[PDB]
Amino acid sequence: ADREDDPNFFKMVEGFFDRGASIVEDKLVEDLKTRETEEQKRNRVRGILRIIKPCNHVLSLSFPIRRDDGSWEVIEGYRAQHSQHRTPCKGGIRYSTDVSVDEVKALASLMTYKCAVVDVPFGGAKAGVKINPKNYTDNELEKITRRFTMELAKKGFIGPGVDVPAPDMSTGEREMSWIADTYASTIGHYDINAHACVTGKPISQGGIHGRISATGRGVFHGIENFINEASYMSILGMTPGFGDKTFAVQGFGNVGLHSMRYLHRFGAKCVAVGESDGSIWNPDGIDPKELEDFKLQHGTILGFPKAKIYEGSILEVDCDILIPAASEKQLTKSNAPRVKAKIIAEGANGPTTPEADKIFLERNIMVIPDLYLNAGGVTVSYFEWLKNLNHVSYGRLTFKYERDSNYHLLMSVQESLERKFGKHGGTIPIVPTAEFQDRISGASEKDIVHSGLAYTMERSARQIMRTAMKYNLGLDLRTAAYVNAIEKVFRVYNE
Amino acid sequence: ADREDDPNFFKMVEGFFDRGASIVEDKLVEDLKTRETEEQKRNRVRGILRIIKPCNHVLSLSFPIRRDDGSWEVIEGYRAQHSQHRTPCKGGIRYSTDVSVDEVKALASLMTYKCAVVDVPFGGAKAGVKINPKNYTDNELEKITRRFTMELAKKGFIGPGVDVPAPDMSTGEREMSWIADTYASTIGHYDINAHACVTGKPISQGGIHGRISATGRGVFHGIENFINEASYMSILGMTPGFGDKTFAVQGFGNVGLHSMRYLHRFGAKCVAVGESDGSIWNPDGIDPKELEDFKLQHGTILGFPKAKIYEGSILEVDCDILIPAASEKQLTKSNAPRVKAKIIAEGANGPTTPEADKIFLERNIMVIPDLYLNAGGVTVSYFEWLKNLNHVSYGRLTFKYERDSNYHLLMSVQESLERKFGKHGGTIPIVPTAEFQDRISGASEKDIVHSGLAYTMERSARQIMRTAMKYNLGLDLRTAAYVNAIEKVFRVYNEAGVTFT
Amino acid sequence: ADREDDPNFFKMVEGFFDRGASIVEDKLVEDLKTRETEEQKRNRVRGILRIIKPCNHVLSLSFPIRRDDGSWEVIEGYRAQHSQHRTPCKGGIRYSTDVSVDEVKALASLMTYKCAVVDVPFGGAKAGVKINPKNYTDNELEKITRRFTMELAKKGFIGPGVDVPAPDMSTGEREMSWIADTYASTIGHYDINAHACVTGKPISQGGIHGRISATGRGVFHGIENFINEASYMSILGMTPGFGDKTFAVQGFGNVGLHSMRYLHRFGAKCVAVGESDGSIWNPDGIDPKELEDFKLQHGTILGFPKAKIYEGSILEVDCDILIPAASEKQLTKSNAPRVKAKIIAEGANGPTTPEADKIFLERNIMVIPDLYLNAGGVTVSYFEWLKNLNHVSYGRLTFKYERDSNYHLLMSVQESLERKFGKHGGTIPIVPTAEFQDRISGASEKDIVHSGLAYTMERSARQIMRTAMKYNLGLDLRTAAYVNAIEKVFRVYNE
Amino acid sequence: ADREDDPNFFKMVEGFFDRGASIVEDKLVEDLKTRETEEQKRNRVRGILRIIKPCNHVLSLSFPIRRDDGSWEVIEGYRAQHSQHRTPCKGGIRYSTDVSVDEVKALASLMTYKCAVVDVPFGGAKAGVKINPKNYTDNELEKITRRFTMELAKKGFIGPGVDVPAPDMSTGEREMSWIADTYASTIGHYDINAHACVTGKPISQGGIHG
Ligand SMILES: NC(=O)C1=CN([C@@H]2O[C@H](COP(=O)(O)OP(=O)(O)OC[C@H]3O[C@@H](n4cnc5c(N)ncnc54)[C@H](OP(=O)(O)O)[C@@H]3O)[C@@H](O)[C@H]2O)C=CC1
Ligand SMILES: NC(=O)C1=CN([C@@H]2O[C@H](COP(=O)(O)OP(=O)(O)OC[C@H]3O[C@@H](n4cnc5c(N)ncnc54)[C@H](OP(=O)(O)O)[C@@H]3O)[C@@H](O)[C@H]2O)C=CC1
Ligand SMILES: NC(=O)C1=CN([C@@H]2O[C@H](COP(=O)(O)OP(=O)(O)OC[C@H]3O[C@@H](n4cnc5c(N)ncnc54)[C@H](OP(=O)(O)O)[C@@H]3O)[C@@H](O)[C@H]2O)C=CC1
Ligand SMILES: Nc1nc2c(ncn2[C@@H]2O[C@H](COP(=O)(O)OP(=O)(O)OP(=O)(O)O)[C@@H](O)[C@H]2O)c(=O)[nH]1
Ligand SMILES: Nc1nc2c(ncn2[C@@H]2O[C@H](COP(=O)(O)OP(=O)(O)OP(=O)(O)O)[C@@H](O)[C@H]2O)c(=O)[nH]1
Ligand SMILES: Nc1nc2c(ncn2[C@@H]2O[C@H](COP(=O)(O)OP(=O)(O)OP(=O)(O)O)[C@@H](O)[C@H]2O)c(=O)[nH]1
Ligand SMILES: Nc1nc2c(ncn2[C@@H]2O[C@H](COP(=O)(O)OP(=O)(O)OP(=O)(O)O)[C@@H](O)[C@H]2O)c(=O)[nH]1
Ligand SMILES: N[C@@H](CCC(=O)O)C(=O)O
Ligand SMILES: N[C@@H](CCC(=O)O)C(=O)O
Ligand SMILES: N[C@@H](CCC(=O)O)C(=O)O
Ligand SMILES: N[C@@H](CCC(=O)O)C(=O)O
Ligand SMILES: [Zn+2]
Ligand SMILES: [Zn+2]
Ligand SMILES: [Zn+2]
Ligand SMILES: [Zn+2]
Ligand SMILES: [Zn+2]
Ligand SMILES: [Zn+2]
Ligand SMILES: [Zn+2]
Ligand SMILES: [Zn+2]
């Protein structure tokens, strides 16, 4: 929302891009070894940079639905694909009334830069259907999801090797299940990869472990990597580690709740949670599980016992870490001054506007940009896609073999230690650590999701941090990120 | 593009539809014998129409091209598909800087209804690439139109059973030629109907006789059928025939030049011709050839020796028939009062605003509506598609059979007569008249394109007259054309038993 | 053919399935989250089950063959596909005159539950062709299976992502190689996975190590996993292990032979072999490699030097383990009373009728059921399909790197120890044991085939045992299997 | 490219092949356990080697290129597919005026055998374009390698599951980046593995280290 700082979402992310585009400009220029030198290069660079920014394809739908009561209602929807520099395109399907071609455009672009930060080989994309799901029956919501999949399918805006959609606001397993089902029942009847057409699926339908809670978990890993970095924690004026920290969470959805779950888990105190009808609060702590229970029970977080109803912008709560996990453009120049938190964890997609970004920097609020924080989603969606493509549960073929080998490896250290210390040593049992015993059959699917996500969110955190320090962006983490997203994408477009 | 009457093209055309949807609502309801009677009758009518109105699909593209000097430039373009109630979608590609999503949506809807009026079984579509072709080389234009065909091809917005493009403003044969080749050379390299993927092609690449000229030829018939409906020539205050009549045309590309040739030929005097940089005028007349000649050499019509450069909007020139045949929204509430013409033939696509539309109605100016008049284009496009689907030129297999059969038919008349009138009659030579001698091998391609277009514009015109009189619309020819369009498209959504569930 | 207990195969298998369902009906109901509680919980469950029982599709075929002699012959055939809850369907091709639509239907249903038991991601399907393969030429058997492949191709009853057939009775490597070719020749000419359209292929033609041997090798594992659980050999009244044990095998084909090989390899004495023209028998042992050479050289077992022509049902031979490894409905209400063996290992497909299952139950005779026991097949079939998908022989790219990794790994233990124990140790070599020497390069293909199979069979063995006890089924191992197969297929059915 | 020791390239490899095939012919017959043994095995070995030697498919192309001066030039080109005993076929693209159907047939036969030596699961294939790339501009070269690819794809002579090329003399990363792009862009937009339609590509376009 916010009426004086409601930039057009696409141009806004275009802004973030352009910014980062400038600081690399000299770097990218000097990289490229084009013989025709001088400034034919500098044009070449903003020439390529001028193709990256715009979306390649955007598909607008109007299709009819027969409502439950029997009337005919026409549904509109869009899907934008921002890049093909990596095939296929990846991106969520969101069901809200805010959906416009433009927010679907900005979201898609965001997805391209996102996957670049996080070394996921997808071009960005995104869909939206202009319905408030709440206002439709489950049966209607089904018809809408299916017909919208048929439209995307025929015009080639879904398909495992074209465009793998995924969840977003007001969509989850359920919908992806229908998407995956009408795709694979019509267009995909022959595709050996028909169920790699969408991600976020029920595990029972092709899904992967922890894909619901994966963007939350990646939020945590993203926060952790910085909060445990003394360089930024000096500058910020706070203690390393999660132990003393308090945080608030805007939105209690897929990334809202699970961000709370993992942050609460490793020691952070969740004092407040908000939703579209109000917030709640308690600086002695809200427990995610109790709150989740109460919310599933009473469809609302409000009136939760162990926390008062908080009157006012939950974004402005006193806390260490502010985590927007709702829609975009919520921390703006209007309310950026009075935010109170020292770390903004952009769990949501593009939730703080550039005007706010400016205040936050000279206020020395640290913004972990959505670019890097909520990529835990595609990264596991990339894992889910890879699972579908490989047609095996990770570990299935190697569990026993790895179990046995580690055992004989361990045995070799033993039989060799006894071969030397004849009997002064005696019999020297070499046994797996309790933790190496969990790790003894090799990585299961779960293990890959957990560890692969952790590696990802740190390897990327490091090269963001390194790029902040190489260009002296200090706490403008977003600008280092785009600098890395650009650098990686630009490398494709010229080489 | 006006300003203080610059309505949204797509919504504008919705209004033209909505107006006719209301004249028919009672009839559609009456006809529909859904047992579920009463008003859930009406609502299902109201509900169907709400499904006819929006475009089904709209594709927006950004793609780069390597411009000739090595620079990269990002080209944008769109194509909208209004309806599938008939397949494929049919509609043109337009290269202007006016090209927006909302334009391309309006044009599309306009093409759906246009086909319903003239019984051409196509849903409506239309594309635009947002460039000024006058600013790029032939090389860059080729690059740009093929990539567009590529980008359309991949997402299902070009294809013979899917969506057959065509020429519009600043595109023609040359572009269609590239569009057919790039399509047929990639996505279509095994399609037996690869080249039915677009109309407006050169004759030599699958094109049909007089496709270029046919939109204007259609304008001609469409004016003829009304200007000789004594009924309407009465109310208008004119005389039947083209005989004394006088006309001006906005535009001198595909639709202007040929409407001008064809009216000139059947006696009407052309007194003015406009293009973007200005107009030229002469009440004694301008010759369509000399003007075309002058234009092909000089790049403009301004300076044509046998005419004065008019100062002021060609739409206001004193004539009988003004022919908007340029871009849309040229006749608005600003300039509608000042039109001097008594018949406006809407050769262009959406040239009249609805506010201007009321003014002409109130001013007793009969606007032949786009819906009907400029349908010459599709109808022959539709023939070009039939031509590609059948992989024979018309007649090719029956010419010698028809000739022989006719000769033998006539001989039967003769021999039978001679048998009766033994010798008081003698030999009674039954010979083809001169004109039947031309028609004696049956129809050539050109014959079909000519006679079939004629049939379509006559049949649809009387349908439009019959309907305007039944509903006492008088000179509201546009809504009568929309009341027909709706009746037909509605018939399709209705009889379908359902549509989906 | 038993003239007084020949249930229609499909209904018979529906009985097994019905049986298991009413056991978990209460279970499926309680788990089912459904807001709409009550018995419209029960009825959705039973409706879903009512969907699972019937085959989704059946293709009946008539196609002419011109015989070697130049005459015309109308060959009938069938493929039934029972479930698509996993794509592709999997299942063998059978050449017999027993092949009827109802038999094919039952076998296909048996495939979907079979893969459910062993966690092989395939819906089930099965095809037969109503021929006596003994009555046709190699050339005629090629025209037939090639044209059958074409009939199956053109109607979507074969394809690497739609339905992957494999061997069964009177088909094998040589027929699979034709199917694979005929498919990949035509339809699949562009398919990167044309060769994964069928399993059982020769190894040079995309096949996998030990897939001929795979099924009985799993018969061995499946017996083994049960013959070593004291809980079950107690109840039985037998000693654990293969040590003292004795078995007879109906069928000496691809299941019978290798079942007999591997059991023999690990102790047990094979005392009877039988086929369709008789049985042999020798209580002191029938060596499998001998019987093979003799079989191969004589096209029969009867009159094998080292055994006597047994007269009387091989199903009633005195032994510990009876292994039906031929056709279905061999063990029926008439002769189940007279079976004498304590463990019936169903390597065949549906060898035991339900009335005979009942008799076996109350006679305290443990029938290890087809559903689980002969799923060694699909499992190794699964492995090859993946092999074909992954376009690499297992280990090819990692052998050298793993070798050096382990040597440096050990070398790390060596030098770490020598750094501590300066010269009080002196030189402390750390070397692979012989067993870790063999694994020191990582798993070969056969490594995976062998350990993957074994893993699959022990794990599936357990979850059957686990189910039996929780449901107090005792020896009704079959109902335990169906209960897992029903459990697993259900739960895919979520919208 | 010599004088009086310049054998037909294809036959020169057939020569090598034929030699190493008598060395094993005895072994192959002894191997094959066919029940109709005899010389009816010696010859069914003779038949099988007779099918291996000749390329299964050769495609000769003439296609036009608009040169940079505007003129039209008919550019000559070939890809031979030696064997499908493993799909897809594998083998490079050579830009040279020595390119002939026999040279390219030979390089093709050399490539299946090269992949057998190192157990690379591809039947051999090779391609040549009869041009001398020092005489052409990069833009021309691009115009060529792309149009060559479009012709290859429509006739089934490139494709990740059917035939995958690679670099060779006067080709490399750049032309690999072109082929990949024109195939993926046209014939295989829906093909998940489109960019596996050729090897040697730039690291950034799907290529590999080293
Ligand atoms: N995999 C993913 O889901 C990923 C999501 N994101 C971004 O995360 C954000 C949320 O995704 P998700 O959590 O899945 O959406 P959900 O539908 O899962 O839940 C979203 C929550 O946000 C609340 N909300 C939305 N707008 C506001 C607002 N203006 N003020 C207060 N509360 C609000 C909703 O409340 P109510 O229910 O009352 O409307 C709901 O509780 C989106 O912006 C998405 O783009 C980023 C990366 C990955
Ligand atoms: N098949 C067809 O071609 C059909 C076309 N139509 C409609 O007819 C109209 C034109 O079609 P077409 O003739 O093909 O397009 P063209 O590309 O042939 O150019 C038409 C003419 O319009 C002139 N023009 C453009 N804008 C203006 C303006 N603002 N004021 C005055 N003159 C102007 C151009 O002059 P300059 O070159 O100086 O811009 C040109 O001479 C469009 O609306 C089209 O949709 C209708 C039916 C079928
Ligand atoms: N991968 C596989 O092959 C799998 C097979 N199965 C099941 O195992 C059984 C057979 O498999 P397979 O070994 O492949 O079949 P085969 O074609 O290999 O022949 C099986 C054996 O059964 C014998 N036989 C057939 N009918 C009778 C009969 N009425 N009485 C006695 N002996 C008979 C045959 O002898 P004769 O030559 O005299 O008929 C032959 O020795 C079937 O139920 C099959 O579905 C289970 C899992 C997988
Ligand atoms: N809503 C909700 N989700 C949960 C809860 N516990 C676990 N999950 C998520 O649901 C999935 C199943 O949980 P587990 O099987 O225990 O897996 P896990 O990786 O050990 O769970 P976590 O480490 O907490 O993410 C995981 O992705 C969890 O993140 C819970 O109490 N409520
Ligand atoms: N632009 C332009 N087109 C012309 C001219 N003369 C004829 N044509 C068109 O080119 C095509 C070939 O002309 P003709 O072979 O005479 O065909 P036609 O049907 O007899 O031509 P018309 O009856 O004059 O339309 C027809 O579509 C004509 O409309 C001209 O002078 N200028
Ligand atoms: N039919 C048949 N198969 C055999 C015979 N000997 C080995 N095999 C199978 O043929 C395949 C190739 O054998 P090997 O290369 O020796 O591999 P293996 O994994 O050691 O096979 P196993 O002896 O079962 O452990 C394996 O599946 C063997 O089971 C035999 O004598 N007859
Ligand atoms: N032509 C050329 N290639 C080089 C040079 N240095 C490295 N490369 C190649 O660049 C690729 C990446 O090289 P490096 O990043 O140095 O890593 P590498 O795997 O050690 O490569 P090698 O030095 O060949 O062992 C490898 O293919 C190298 O062979 C060089 O100086 N000239
Ligand atoms: N839409 C999610 C990612 C969804 C996905 O591709 O899995 C995001 O904005 O990051
Ligand atoms: N632009 C033309 C195209 C007709 C066609 O050829 O489809 C029209 O609006 O009628
Ligand atoms: N007929 C085999 C099929 C095994 C396979 O799919 O390879 C079975 O019953 O399991
Ligand atoms: N053309 C090279 C390599 C071919 C390839 O990489 O496929 C050769 O002669 O082996
Ligand atoms: Zn549609
Ligand atoms: Zn997890
Ligand atoms: Zn594109
Ligand atoms: Zn004509
Ligand atoms: Zn047939
Ligand atoms: Zn083995
Ligand atoms: Zn060609
Ligand atoms: Zn290297």
Side-chain angles (χ1 to χ4, degrees), chain C residues 65-124:
Chain C
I65 280 305
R66 206 180 179 220
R67 288 275 226 150
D68 274 13
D69 72 45
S71 60
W72 282 109
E73 171 133 341
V74 169
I75 312 273
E76 40 193 37
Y78 308 95
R79 184 134 176 114
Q81 295 168 332
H82 163 103
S83 187
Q84 268 105 35
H85 82 271
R86 292 277 171 272
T87 60
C89 318
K90 200 93 184 54
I93 314 195
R94 185 184 276 202
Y95 290 178
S96 150
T97 73
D98 303 353
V99 152
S100 74
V101 47
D102 270 326
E103 149 156 357
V104 127
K105 251 144 90 183
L107 284 180
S109 49
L110 224 36
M111 287 291 339
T112 89
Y113 315 138
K114 180 187 310 195
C115 314
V117 165
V118 294
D119 298 5
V120 173
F122 300 147

Side-chain angles (χ1 to χ4, degrees), chain C residues 232 235-236 360-361 364-367 473-478:
Chain C
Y232 281 98
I235 281 182
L236 273 192
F360 285 144
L361 202 285
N364 262 260
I365 314 277
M366 174 178 87
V367 306
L473 298 169
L475 287 197
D476 209 330
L477 281 192
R478 195 126 69 198

Side-chain angles (χ1 to χ4, degrees), chain B residues 209-210 213 217 257-258 261-262 265 289 292 446 450:
Chain B
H209 164 80
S213 60
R217 206 176 231 256
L257 185 147
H258 292 295
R261 285 173 64 239
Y262 282 116
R265 164 170 327 182
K289 192 58 181 164
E292 173 181 4
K446 144 161 63 39
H450 291 167

Side-chain angles (χ1 to χ4, degrees), chain B residues 90-92 111 114 126 165-168 199 211 349 374 377-378 381:
Chain B
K90 196 82 191 51
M111 296 218 46
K114 172 192 306 189
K126 164 90 48 166
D168 192 85
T199 46
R211 177 55 191 78
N349 263 312
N374 72 43
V378 232
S381 267

Side-chain angles (χ1 to χ4, degrees), chain C residues 419-459:
Chain C
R419 199 169 310 111
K420 187 152 226 330
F421 314 140
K423 273 80 186 301
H424 317 339
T427 199
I428 311 168
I430 301 284
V431 294
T433 75
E435 205 89 31
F436 181 63
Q437 261 287 142
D438 292 327
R439 337 178 83 80
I440 215 183
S441 271
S444 82
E445 159 171 316
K446 100 194 281 165
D447 291 353
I448 291 310
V449 185
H450 293 162
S451 45
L453 183 56
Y455 176 90
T456 290
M457 288 281 89
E458 185 231 330
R459 177 167 166 240

Side-chain angles (χ1 to χ4, degrees), chain C residues 152-442:
Chain C
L152 285 195
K154 294 191 294 215
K155 293 309 191 216
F157 286 60
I158 187 191
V162 0
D163 176 351
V164 179
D168 198 88
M169 287 173 77
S170 300
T171 67
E173 256 189 328
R174 203 210 39 216
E175 286 79 6
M176 297 315 109
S177 185
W178 289 328
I179 293 162
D181 193 73
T182 307
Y183 180 89
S185 271
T186 72
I187 314 299
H189 65 249
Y190 283 135
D191 209 327
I192 190 167
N193 305 307
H195 285 85
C197 70
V198 68
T199 292
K201 310 189 298 295
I203 293 207
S204 74
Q205 322 253 315
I208 190 94
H209 166 92
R211 153 63 207 178
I212 307 205
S213 82
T215 167
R217 182 188 246 266
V219 171
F220 155 79
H221 277 121
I223 298 166
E224 150 157 61
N225 264 297
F226 277 105
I227 214 166
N228 287 335
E229 198 78 357
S231 148
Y232 281 98
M233 303 303 103
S234 100
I235 281 182
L236 273 192
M238 316 177 92
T239 283
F242 290 114
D244 42 300
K245 271 64 175 38
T246 308
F247 68 99
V249 180
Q250 191 195 32
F252 197 42
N254 291 295
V255 279
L257 199 166
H258 293 113
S259 325
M260 185 220 189
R261 279 186 69 245
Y262 289 112
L263 294 155
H264 180 275
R265 168 169 317 158
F266 296 79
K269 277 206 265 171
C270 179
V271 289
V273 170
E275 309 183 300
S276 325
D277 64 333
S279 324
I280 66 179
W281 160 89
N282 190 307
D284 252 342
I286 319 182
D287 178 283
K289 188 46 189 164
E290 250 157 29
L291 219 227
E292 208 184 323
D293 302 319
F294 178 92
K295 165 60 141 162
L296 269 275
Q297 186 49 23
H298 287 116
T300 190
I301 64 179
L302 297 194
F304 171 62
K306 270 102 145 331
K308 192 211 260 149
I309 284 85
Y310 195 91
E311 67 292 48
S313 187
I314 203 191
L315 312 183
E316 318 180 13
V317 162
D318 159 74
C319 57
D320 307 310
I321 310 270
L322 172 63
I323 304 179
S327 73
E328 66 266 2
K329 276 183 275 188
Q330 288 311 284
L331 293 162
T332 86
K333 156 188 208 180
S334 303
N335 65 350
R338 324 180 257 130
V339 165
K340 304 184 200 335
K342 273 74 82 187
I343 294 181
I344 299 192
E346 287 187 329
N349 260 327
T352 307
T353 84
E355 213 79 76
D357 210 52
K358 191 197 165 341
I359 287 176
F360 285 144
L361 202 285
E362 51 206 10
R363 220 164 146 246
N364 262 260
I365 314 277
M366 174 178 87
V367 306
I368 318 193
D370 51 16
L371 241 185
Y372 159 69
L373 213 229
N374 58 51
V378 278
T379 315
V380 161
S381 277
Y382 184 26
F383 291 175
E384 150 183 1
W385 185 65
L386 272 41
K387 197 223 180 152
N388 303 159
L389 293 186
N390 276 281
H391 297 87
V392 85
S393 35
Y394 213 91
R396 170 55 190 264
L397 303 81
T398 39
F399 289 140
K400 209 255 185 200
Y401 185 92
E402 270 221 69
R403 195 169 316 116
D404 315 345
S405 211
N406 295 314
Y407 279 117
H408 288 116
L409 197 181
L410 295 185
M411 199 60 203
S412 282
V413 201
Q414 168 150 342
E415 307 200 332
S416 296
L417 293 162
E418 295 178 335
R419 199 169 310 111
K420 187 152 226 330
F421 314 140
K423 273 80 186 301
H424 317 339
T427 199
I428 311 168
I430 301 284
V431 294
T433 75
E435 205 89 31
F436 181 63
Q437 261 287 142
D438 292 327
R439 337 178 83 80
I440 215 183
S441 271

Side-chain angles (χ1 to χ4, degrees), chain A residues 131-144:
Chain A
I131 62 136
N132 175 353
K134 286 176 209 313
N135 303 333
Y136 303 83
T137 87
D138 283 13
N139 188 233
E140 291 169 350
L141 276 179
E142 185 176 14
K143 288 164 173 152
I144 300 176

